[PDB]
Amino acid sequence: DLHPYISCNISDFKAQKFLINVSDTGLYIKTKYQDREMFPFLSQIEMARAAGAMASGNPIIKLTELSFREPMLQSGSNEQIRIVLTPDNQGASYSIEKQSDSSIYSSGRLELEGGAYENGNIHLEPFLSQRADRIPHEAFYQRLAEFGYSCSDSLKAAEHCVSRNGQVLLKIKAKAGPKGCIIKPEVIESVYQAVIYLAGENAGELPENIKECTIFDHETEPVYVYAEQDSAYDVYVLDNAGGILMELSGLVF
Amino acid sequence: DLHPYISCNISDFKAQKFLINVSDTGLYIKTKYQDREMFPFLSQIEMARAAGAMASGNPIIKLTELSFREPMLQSGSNEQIRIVLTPDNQGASYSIEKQSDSSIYSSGRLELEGGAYENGNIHLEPFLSQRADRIPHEAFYQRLAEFGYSCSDSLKAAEHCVSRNGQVLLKIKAKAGPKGCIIKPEVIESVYQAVIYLAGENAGELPENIKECTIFDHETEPVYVYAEQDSAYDVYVLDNAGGILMELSGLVF
Incomplete structure (x- = not known):
């Protein structure tokens, strides 16, 4: 395994990509909107951060313009999940998809030009x-x-x-x-x-959009x-x- | 393992590539030019064929313009070996390299537009x-x-x-x-x-060039x-x- 949620690298000429496998994690949520259990939404940020770091060769500090479109229903069918990463001049984009039909669970961007951010303080x-x-x-x-x-x-x-x-x-x-x-x-x-x-x-019970995610x-x-x-x-x-x-x-x- | 000579996919944004590991194969040659044992030269074609098939999604039938530049000395240092594959309009190219310094053991091309060839006959x-x-x-x-x-x-x-x-x-x-x-x-x-x-x-005791290799x-x-x-x-x-x-x-x- 490359990561607790990433089992291996399945990149090819067509696109950079990794295989996601969260079957054997004990992590699920349930909402009133769904009969079936779900893998938590926001842990997908870790999937992108881990995939991006491996694809870019450097840490991932900032993710921007995150979009969550479908929940990761966990059933018996076991739809294989993959993450596609596409480099571009601004930076890179990522898609977390069903492998069978490429339908998106969530998408976002990755900052690749690493910059030191000074963190703030909440007066507790x-x-x-x-x-x-x-x-x-x-x-x-x-x-x-x-x-x-x-x-x-x-x-x-x-x-x-x-x-x-x-x-x-x-x-x-x-x-x-x-x-x-x-x-x-x-x-x-x-x-x-x-x-x-x-x-x-x-x-x-689904965060449609998240503008920024910074890991200080x-x-x-x-x-x-x-x-x-x-x-x-x-x-x-x-x-x-x-x-x-x-x-x-x-x-x- | 992806293949007896390929352990995993280590592709990234910079290039498509796989990790080669022939340590635990029992295959070596010796020549009068070298004190050290060597991994056989031509088995690298299998490395390219296997890597190319995985990178392209289709079988590899024909390899052209093969160039052998250095023998795979097998020592204790264990230089990690990788294959880089670069797509282009003609087809794709491949480099089998030391990972530490990218120095080439052998290089060649891959035909990606698969075409049925009819094989010949040698009158035995x-x-x-x-x-x-x-x-x-x-x-x-x-x-x-x-x-x-x-x-x-x-x-x-x-x-x-x-x-x-x-x-x-x-x-x-x-x-x-x-x-x-x-x-x-x-x-x-x-x-x-x-x-x-x-x-x-x-x-x-080193085949500097090979024009064509076809697998019928x-x-x-x-x-x-x-x-x-x-x-x-x-x-x-x-x-x-x-x-x-x-x-x-x-x-x-």
């Missing part, structure tokens, strides 16, 4: 003072369930939740897992969970997830002191 | 009548040794030899081996051995190797009745 103090306001782990997910979202325990990283004024700070505990994942499945799913909590009924620091331990905001959302993964490790800007359902 | 009768003229297996290779060529028993497929007028017909027995090899190592090495026998001292039939069992001919050579692999299964034209030392 206002959320920390309301210790009584904290929603416990069990209640937090019961509410997402009442909004129509549930997930495997392997994706339940939220320990407690503070929500005020259309803003939410989640306390998360990452799960040590395969070395290969830069973006851990439970961490990036906490990002999606935070949005569903703010959006509530306004959640489409994948070695520091993620501790918090902060989300805010015109149904457009910005999300941040933070270290123990608020330091921004990853940013998702302009998520729109 | 004249060589069959001289049963007394047959050189036995042991004597045949003792003579190649006296010309400065020896090889592992895994490449000793010649059973006996008939030579007249600068022409040679070898009786060969293929060795059942890994399914993946279309061109078996001992079969194509018999081709080279036949040439060394005709060329003798005129052998350079890789399922029928190869039985004979016929070679002839201005130190340019033409060689043929034949079925039990002379039917041409593979042609190497214009081999030049």
Whole structure:
């Protein structure tokens, strides 16, 4: 395997591409819109980041103009999943597809000219003072369930939740897992969970568009997830002191 | 493994390419020009044919303008070997290289517009009548040794030899081996051995150029190797009745 979600390189003259296999990961979500279980939406960013790094020879720091079109239904048929990457002058594009018919699950762009970004800081103090306001782990997910979202325990990283004024700070505990994942499945799913909590009924349980995704620091331990905001959302993964490790800007359902 | 000599696909945006690994094949030759053992020259055609088929999505029938520049010395350093394939309007080109410095072992072209070729026939009768003229297996290779060529028993497929007028017909027995090899190592090495026998001292123990290589039939069992001919050579692999299964034209030392 090239990566926990990428089994091998199947590139050819026609296009650069890799074979995706998430059968044996324990990661699924369910929504009120679907009878069948699904592979979490946003973990596809890790698929693109891993594929792009291998195809480009350098790390992938920034992904832009992400588009999610279909959920990864997990059934018995087992539709083989592949990612196609196309270089161009701006950078590169990527398509995560069914191999049988090339139909798109999600698409996006990759920044290939690596540039050092200085990360920001979320001042965490206002959320920390309301210790009584904290929603416990069990209640937090019961509410997402009442909004129509549930997930495997392997994706339940939220320990407690503070929500005020259309803003939410989640306390998360990452799960040590395969070395290969830069973006851990439970961490990036906490990002999606935070949005569903703010959006509530306004959640489409499919993020149609995401303008930017920047990965400032994948070695520091993620501790918090902060989300805010015109149904457009910005999300941040933070270290123990608020330091921004990853940013998702302009998520729109 | 993608093939007995190809372990995986390592293509990227810069070029289509595969990783070669022949460490654990039992196949080596020695020449008077080299202290070290070598991987047989002509088995690289199988590397190109296998890589080209995978890169193009269709069989490889014809290889043209083959150029051999360096022997594959087998040492302890273990230089990782790769094949680069470059598509173009005529067809495609291929380079078999050291991965560390991209230095070429051999190069050639691939025909990608597959066309049905009708194979020819070598009339075998004249060589069959001289049963007394047959050189036995042991004597045949003792003579190649006296010309400065020896090889592992895994490449000793010649059973006996008939030579007249600068022409040679070898009786060969293929060795059942890994399914993946279309061109078996001992079969194509018999081709080279036949040439060394005709060329003798005129052998350079490195085939600098080969104009054409056509593979008409890789399922029928190869039985004979016929070679002839201005130190340019033409060689043929034949079925039990002379039917041409593979042609190497214009081999030049």
